[PDB]
Amino acid sequence: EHSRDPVSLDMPVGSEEEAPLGDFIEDAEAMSAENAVIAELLHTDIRSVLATLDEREHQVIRLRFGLDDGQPRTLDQIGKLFGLSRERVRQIERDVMSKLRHGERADRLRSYAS
- List residues binding another protein (CB under 8 A): 1-2, 4-11, 15, 17, 20-27, 29, 31-33, 36-38, 40-42, 45-46, 65-67, 70, 97, 100-101, 107-109, 111-114
Cβ distance to another protein smaller for residue 83 or 97: 97
CB of 3 to another protein, least distance (A): 11
CA atoms within 13 A on the CB side of 83: 0
What are the C-alpha distances in Å from 88 to residues 66, 79, 112, 113?
19, 9, 29, 28
Cβ distance to another protein smaller for residue 26 or 55: 26
- State the first-to-last Cα distance of the chain, in angstroms, to the nearest integer: 37
Cβ distance to another protein smaller for residue 11 or 81: 11
Nearest Cα residue to 56 out of 48, 64, 47: 64
**51 near 62, Cβ under 8 Å?**
no
CB of 91 to another protein, least distance (A): 16
Give the type of residue at 44. T
CB of 103 to another protein, least distance (A): 13
Cβ distance to another protein smaller for residue 7 or 51: 7
